[PDB]
Amino acid sequence: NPNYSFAGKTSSISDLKEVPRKNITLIRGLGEVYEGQVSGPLQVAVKTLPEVCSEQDELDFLMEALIISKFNHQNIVRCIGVSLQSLPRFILLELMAGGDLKSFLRETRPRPSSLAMLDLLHVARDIACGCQYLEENHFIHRDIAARNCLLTCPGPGRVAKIGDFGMACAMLPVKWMPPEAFMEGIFTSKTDTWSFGVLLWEIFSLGYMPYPSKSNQEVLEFVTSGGRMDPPKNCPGPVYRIMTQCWQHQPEDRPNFAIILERIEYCTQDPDVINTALPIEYGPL
Numbered sequence: 001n002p003n004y005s006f007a008g009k010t011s012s013i014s015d016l017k018e019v020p021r022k023n024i025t026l027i028r029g030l031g032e033v034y035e036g037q038v039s040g041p042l043q044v045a046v047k048t049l050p051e052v053c054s055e056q057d058e059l060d061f062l063m064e065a066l067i068i069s070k071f072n073h074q075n076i077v078r079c080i081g082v083s084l085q086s087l088p089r090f091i092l093l094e095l096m097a098g099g100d101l102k103s104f105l106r107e108t109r110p111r112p113s114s115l116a117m118l119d120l121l122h123v124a125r126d127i128a129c130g131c132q133y134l135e136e137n138h139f140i141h142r143d144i145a146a147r148n149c150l151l152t153c154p155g156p157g158r159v160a161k162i163g164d165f166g167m168a169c170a171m172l173p174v175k176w177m178p179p180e181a182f183m184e185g186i187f188t189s190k191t192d193t194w195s196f197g198v199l200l201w202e203i204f205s206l207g208y209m210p211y212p213s214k215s216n217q218e219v220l221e222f223v224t225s226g227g228r229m230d231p232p233k234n235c236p237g238p239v240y241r242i243m244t245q246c247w248q249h250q251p252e253d254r255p256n257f258a259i260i261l262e263r264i265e266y267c268t269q270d271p272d273v274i275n276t277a278l279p280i281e282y283g284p285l
C-alpha cells in the first residue's frame with residue numbers, strides 16, 4: 001500500500017488509545033460496522049476485524065487506525081481509539097448519524113424543501129476542505145466518491161466528512177478515475193481532483209450513478225476519447241464549470257483543492273446560483 005511506509009515510520013501504536021474490551025458495547029449493525037458505546041458514555045462507530053483473517057489483513061487493520069489517527073481536521077472522520085488486544089479486534093471511529101452521502105442524496109431528493117442548492121454547496125465545500133487538508137499533508141485518497149463521504153446528521157447544520165469504507169479490473173471504480181489512473185495506474189493529488197469532480201456531479205445530480213447509461217468499459221472508451229458528462233439537471237453553470245475543470249485530460253491542467261475550494265465558495269456568494277431550484281421527481285414519471 002502506497003501509504004504504509006510513511007505512516008509506519010511517522011506514527012506509533014502508542015499513539016492509539018487502547019480501550020478495555022469490557023468497556024465496549026455493540027448496540028446495532030450499521031453496514032462490519034456497528035454503532036457502539038464506550039462507558040464505565042461515548043457514542044461511537046466500531047469497525048471489526050474478522051477473527052479468520054490473514055497477517056496482511058492484520059496489518060491493513062492496524063494501518064487504517066494509524067493513518068486516520070495522523071489527521072486532525074473537522075472534515076475528516078476521527079479515530080476515537082482501538083481495542084486490538086481482544087478478539088475480534090475493534091477500531092473505534094467517529095459516529096456519523098447522517099450515514100453515507102450517496103444514500104442521503106437519494107433519500108432526500110425533493111418529492112411532491114428537503115434540500116436547497118446552498119445545502120449541496122456546503123456539502124461540496126466541506127469535502128473540498130478536507131481534500132485540501134489531505135493534499136497539504138501529501139495524502140492521496142484514491143477513492144473520492146459520495147459513498148465514502150459521511151454526514152453528522154440529516155437536518156440543517158449537517159457536516160460532511162471524508163472517510164473510506166475500503167471497498168476498493170472489474171473492481172476498479174473506473175467512473176471516478178481519470179485516464180492516467182485507469183490506463184497507467186498513476187495516482188496523484190490531481191487524480192483526486194478528477195474524482196472530486198465526479199463527486200460534485202453526484203451531489204448536484206442528487207445521487208445519480210455517474211455516466212448513467214454507460215458500463216465501465218463504455219465509460220473507459222468515452223473518457224479516453226475526450227467525452228465528458230453533461231451537467232446534472234438544473235445545475236448552475238458556475239458549478240458545472242468546476243466539474244469540467246476537474247476533468248481536464250492532463251493533470252497539469254486540473255485545479256488543486258485550494259482553487260476548487262475558492263471557486264465553490266464563490267458560488268455560495270452568487271444569489272443566482274443558490275436561489276436556483278433543484279428538480280422535483282413526480283412519482284408516475
Ligand SMILES: Cc1cc(-c2cc(NC(=O)c3ccc(CN4CCN(C)CC4)cc3)[nH]n2)ccc1NC(=O)Nc1cc(C(C)C)on1
Nearest residue numbers: 030045047068077093094095096097098099141163164165
Ligand atoms: C469504515 C468506517 C465507518 C465510519 C462510520 C460510519 C458511520 N455511520 C454509518 O455507517 C451509518 C449511520 C446512520 C445510518 C442510518 N441512516 C441515516 C439516517 N437516515 C434517516 C436513515 C439512514 C446508516 C449508516 N459512522 N462512522 C467512519 C470511518 C470508517 N473508516 C475510515 O473512514 N477509514 C479511512 C479513512 C481514510 C481517510 C482517507 C483518512 O482512510 N481510511
